[PDB]
From Swiss-Prot, chain A:
Name used for this protein in its record: D-alanine--D-alanine ligase
Cofactor: Mg(2+); Mn(2+)
Species of the source: Staphylococcus aureus (strain COL)
Catalytic reaction list: 2 D-alanine + ATP = D-alanyl-D-alanine + ADP + phosphate + H(+)
Purpose of the protein: Cell wall formation.
Pathway entry: Cell wall biogenesis; peptidoglycan biosynthesis
Keyword annotations of the record: ATP-binding, Cell shape, Cell wall biogenesis/degradation, Cytoplasm, Ligase, Magnesium, Manganese, Metal-binding, Nucleotide-binding, Peptidoglycan synthesis
Residues the entry annotates as binding Mg(2+) 2: E290, N292
Length: 344, 345
């Protein structure tokens, strides 16, 4: 029997979605196969652990833990069965991405999903776009700069936005995911204001050409030999979850999107999973928008539903993610041995 | 006094250097200005704390090392033995386990202010392929190179070997992308050697870089700052052949030195560094410049390149340590300020 730790909560009011997600995962997890503990990280950063979850959690209130089992390191290094975890499943963004993965790595705890680089890469929209560019994936025109750069080269930068992009454009802090400080700008005065607004939240920005496009998402699962689902659509009458799986798109367009999703996964060197989010215009021009390293993971979110469409049930998906974590961490340690052995 | 913690040792034989660097740093810190705790990470990865270093560390044996207090990872790591939070934590160790970027992640989770590079910059300059991609986007010159995953070599071996031939001039270097360990690096003079060289590197890493090699001079530039970084004049390790005395500034034309200074700033920005970086270039006999790598955690003994480059600029080793602390606090205040505004929208 394998020991699993679900970690959820977090310093933010991504709180409720994190708790809900944990309920879903806990209630889907195969239980005579998995011994399961939970750690609720409160907002204040108190880690509260409950051991050996056996019953269906009927209510989200159950998971707002009060009591806790030790220090952070002790919480993570040992399962309730007295032995290390086979996998820890983070269902929180760490105060951003990549930080909690660092902590797991320092503790040598096996964990689900993306690693440090890939998590942080995907959370920085500029880095992400540069990785996608190098890989040959199509993207909309954009510009990026640092505050230091804007402070010295404003006129030059604002000229770039005019010669290179068509309004409307979006100004987007590079380093959030929260959508704060995003602004749609229809002209240069709006752009100027958008930049000023945004720099109140971040020291680095991307200015992207807007499009009218469908929002098409592909789920990828794996480590070294990832697989991609048929795409799904986030259907919306107005751009500013209702899902259609598979997406109403030509077969050839679906195949291209599946293969680009695999390329996007590789470009940011993902592990475990990624959701690749595209723009597909009414003429079937395809741009990758972003990858999401920690996609919504509720029983009804796009990422699990894309897998269900392929015949991979939600309990089976969670199992697959866990075995991937196990494999990745096993492979890390084995290469350590070979390297150690080389040094000797 | 301000309150500082130095973290050193780690899961490696980086140990002896890391210990010496901790000594140097500690002896460079004015204890009437700073209250200093240290944390040693043993090879098995146990954290051991020694409080309130007040005297010169005349020898390493005066450090307790494994014999400091047994430390769990907890909110406590933010608190000095004075009972004040640390103003800055100075990591003088790598990612034995994980990558670079992992201890930074731990510090961010615990909201500990720390010196130097953040998660993404640390991790990106430790992955040679991401690093190269970032430098290419920034328009910095680099030697020709190819990269691939094991899974890609597995199914496209022929095409890849032919890409090497059609793109790279032999000899080439096979480099694991994710180690700084030099384990699995090899110099390959033809396809036969390359093939061997690839097979061997894949024993240790799942992603490789193949690079056109060049014998050339190795020239380094130090950069210090967060949002308004400054670069040193370049330096070089003194030697007649390219196949521990430094020359600072390097024996290079002034225009070449200036170009390098500015390239170092660009490399700093390309990997979104904080605190510092060392940019390491190749410069050929005809003054062709290629950035080799950035180093997010460059050697930091009293006699190391990074410190000596600043010394030539008039910034003493103690002043350099104080500046890095001040940049650490600044960065962390900036995060706190940003989180507040974000949260309040």
């Amino acid at each position: 029997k394998e020991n699993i730790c679900i970690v959820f909560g977090g310093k933010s009011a991504e709180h409720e979605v994190s708790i809900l997600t944990a309920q879903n995962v806990l209630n889907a997890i195969d239980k005579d196969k998995y011994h399961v503990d939970i750690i609720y990280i409160t907002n204040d950063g108190d880690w509260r652990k409950q051991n050996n979850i056996t019953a269906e959690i009927k209510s989200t209130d159950e998971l707002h833990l009060e009591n806790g089992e030790l220090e952070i390191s002790q919480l993570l290094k040992e399962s309730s069965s007295g032995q290390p975890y086979d996998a820890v499943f983070p269902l929180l963004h760490g105060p951003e991405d990549g930080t909690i993965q660092g902590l797991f790595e320092v503790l040598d705890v096996p964990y689900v999903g993306n690693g440090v680089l890939s998590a942080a890469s995907s959370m920085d929209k500029l880095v992400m776009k540069q990785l996608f560019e190098h890989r040959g994936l199509p993207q909309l025109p954009y510009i990026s700069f640092l505050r230091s750069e804007y402070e010295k080269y404003e006129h030059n930068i604002l000229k770039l936005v005019n010669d290179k992009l068509n309004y409307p454009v979006f100004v987007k802090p590079a380093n959030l995911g929260s959508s704060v400080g995003i602004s749609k700008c229809n002209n240069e005065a709006e752009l100027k204001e958008g930049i000023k607004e945004a720099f109140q939240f971040d020291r680095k920005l991307v200015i992207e050409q807007g499009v009218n496009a469908r929002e098409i998402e592909v789920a990828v699962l794996g480590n070294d030999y990832p697989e991609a689902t048929w795409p799904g659509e986030v259907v919306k009458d107005v751009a500013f979850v209702q899902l259609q799986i598979p997406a109403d798109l030509d077969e050839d367009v679906q195949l291209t999107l599946r293969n680009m999703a695999l390329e996007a996964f590789k470009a940011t060197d993902c592990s475990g999973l990624v959701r690749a989010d595209f723009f597909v215009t009414e003429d079937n021009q395809i741009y990758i928008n972003e990858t999401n390293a920690m996609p919504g993971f509720t029983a009804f979110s796009m990422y699990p539903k894309l897998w269900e469409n392929m015949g991979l049930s939600y309990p089976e998906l969670i199992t697959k993610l866990i075995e991937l974590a196990k494999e990745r961490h096993q492979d890390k340690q084995k290469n350590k041995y070979k390297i150690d052995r080389s040094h000797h």
